[PDB]
Design a protein around this ligand. Structure first.
Ligand code: MTE
Ligand code: MTE
Ligand code: MO
Ligand code: MO
Lengths: 372, 372
């Protein structure tokens, strides 16, 4: 069994695939803490988890002229000043199951928890690339390609890329992380080194980093070219042309209700409704509207968190709103967020439906009853 | 009459206010050309149009230490290399009248034409500020405040501000424009000098520029502090607190159908449906979906224009889609756009309604009939 050497996990997760392991935290715990504990942070593995001996590990970094820099773990820790960045990672497939309610799609059936937040510690990718000898600025459109140590039976590594400009920007905070919430990177989350690309879809944060290369083109890997793209609702498996749509990088504004859960019976008097909101590209969440009546009327929620600098809101905003609730009534609790560019979430899922089930950002709706 | 010295205008505009002058081009002409002719470009004036003698004109630029640089028109033309930027300006109030259909709002009743596109020529604001002696980077959050020559009866100039970072960024393309579509700036559009802030709401592109100042704070002017902000649908005139929401800078993804027009009877066979789409923040439009049946099914439109570099799509994308149409049928033509961060437009207007009528980006719907 290629998966026999996989790490053990916390017993209470919502697992949607054992092999490869793909799991999200229970929704009742997801927004309990601003920083998701390591043991609960959602896990998305395409492949078996690599088993890495720390001391023999080398990160290969290809330089401008085609020479190869080779960095040990200890050298990554000591050569470059450690930077810490608190960033939310969200999988493209988050809330996919709601898309499937409209018309079935292919993909891991994620509920609202394919998103988590951690403080990440590591080398700035910018610094590593300058050390390899690259300039601030290359002419034209360049990309930094990443390969992980995990590979399919045919030998193709997990791979992704980001634009060179984002890799080199001080403000974009792209990390080669070896620390997660103050402890060393767990195996499931990329031990010993992962890329963390703040404000950008989870897919680009390559775990178990083996190689960093600079190229005139995007990553040639199947996951960069033939996956993680959004399409019209009209597109099906027979008509899909992956060249017609851009690789997802930044994600659009997103939110969900974590408390209370669908089907609940809640006591009369006061109900505290909680959830999360987040947007891609470092765009702050500026407002979260909450409705108890299926989105006819709304009240403004309270946003928690400490504000980040402009253009650098990498971390989700947790929200809450305490409302009065009348004995023996039905509620449809809906939330929607607004980011600093004043993007908004769409009303319904059908018009954003796509064959891959990605980019599921329509209002989250939770139906509950009030007890008597 | 304070408006007697105002310029004459093209006879065929859709004027919503004579004094001060506020007008949009007819929708049938709006998307006819990629670059909106100067005579048709939408005009938004809060005040009488300033009468400016070109030679005695001086732009005041305050330097780092509180000294004042003073620049003539000729010096602005000769001192700094002319840069050309093609950018769409969209008023916050675009498509306000559709918001009013839900619940009446205060404001100029714009239809879909409070948006236009031009190639702008001028000094990079970045270069002017470096010449005044400012550094690449100031510590903390700084703003560049602009004042126009137009003032109210009490003497307060039109004013706005943008973040310092955007003013200094080579890639953000902020201009002090003295040329518009290859000719000198018309009076209505800011003669002799206006700021052009690409990817950002029209309000910040100060016309008739008199002063540029660098400040630790946003512009203190009423239009920066107590206007151009988005609010929840629940907020009314008695509850509004302008400190709770950020000044609009970047605008969200937007589109409209320009052809055919509401109420039309069209011939059977083939119908070419045309419109525009655009997004704030230099985010490209990557797809436009069009529906003939009120948004139940959709087809992908054709996007026209030449692609801009990543993060710099300042100009709208014009779109078209030719469809078959059956004799004696009713159509509800709807469009929606998707930007490069995969933001989308919301289904309906009520949930985005606000008391100022700004930020009106729900699907544009056009009802027509087919002849027999
Ligand atoms: N090497 C490698 N990196 C990877 C993946 C993978 O399968 N292999 N999955 C990607 C995807 S699709 C997501 S959403 C994130 C999930 O990161 P997490 O497991 O730490 O939450 O990792 C990304 N990085
Ligand atoms: N000096 C000055 N600048 C101004 C205005 C104004 O009233 N005075 N209107 C602003 C607003 S709200 C908009 S939408 C744009 C409109 O620019 P246009 O008239 O060239 O289309 O100008 C902006 N710049
Ligand atoms: Mo993912
Ligand atoms: Mo405006």
């Amino acid at each position: 069994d290629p998966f026999a050497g996989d790490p053990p996990r916390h017993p209470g997760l919502r697992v949607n695939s054992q092999k490869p392991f793909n799991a999200e935290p229970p929704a009742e715990l997801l927004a309990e803490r601003f920083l998701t504990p390591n043991e609960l942070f959602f896990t998305r593995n395409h492949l078996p988890v690599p088993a890495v001996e720390p001391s023999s590990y080398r990160l290969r970094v290809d330089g401008p002229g085609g020479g190869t820099l080779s960095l040990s773990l200890a050298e990554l820790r000591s050569r470059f000043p450690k930077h810490e960045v608190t960033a939310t990672l969200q999988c493209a497939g988050n809330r996919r199951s709601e898309m499937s309610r409209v018309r079935p799609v292919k993909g891991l059936p994620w509920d609202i928890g394919a998103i988590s937040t951690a403080r990440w510690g590591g080398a700035r990718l910018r610094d590593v690339l300058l050390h390899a000898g690259f300039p601030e600025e290359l002419q034209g459109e360049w990309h930094v390609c990443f390969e992980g140590l995990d590979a399919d039976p045919g030998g193709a590594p997990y791979g992704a890329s980001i634009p060179y400009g984002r890799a080199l920007s001080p403000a974009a905070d792209v990390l080669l992380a070896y620390e997660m919430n103050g402890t060393e990177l767990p195996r499931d989350h990329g031990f010993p080194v992962r890329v963390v690309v703040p404000g950008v879809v989870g897919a680009r944060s390559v775990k178990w980093l083996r190689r960093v290369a600079v190229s005139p083109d995007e990553s040639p890997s199947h996951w960069q070219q033939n996956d993680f793209k959004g399409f019209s609702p009209c597109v099906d498996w027979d008509t899909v042309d992956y060249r017609t749509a851009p690789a997802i990088q930044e994600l659009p504004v997103q939110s969900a209700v974590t408390q209370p859960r669908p089907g609940a019976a809640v006591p009369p008097g006061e109900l505290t409704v909680k959830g999360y909101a987040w947007s891609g590209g470092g765009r702050e969440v500026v407002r979260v509207d909450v409705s108890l009546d299926g989105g006819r009327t709304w009240k403004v929620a309270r946003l928690m968190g400490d504000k980040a600098p402009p253009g650098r809101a990498w971390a989700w905003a947790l929200w809450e709103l305490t409302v009065p609730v009348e004995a023996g009534t039905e509620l449809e609790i809906v939330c929607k967020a607004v980011d600093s560019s004043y993007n908004v979430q769409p009303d319904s899922v059908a018009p954003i439906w796509n064959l891959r089930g990605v980019l599921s950002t329509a209002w989250h709706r939770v139906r509950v009853s009030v007890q008597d």
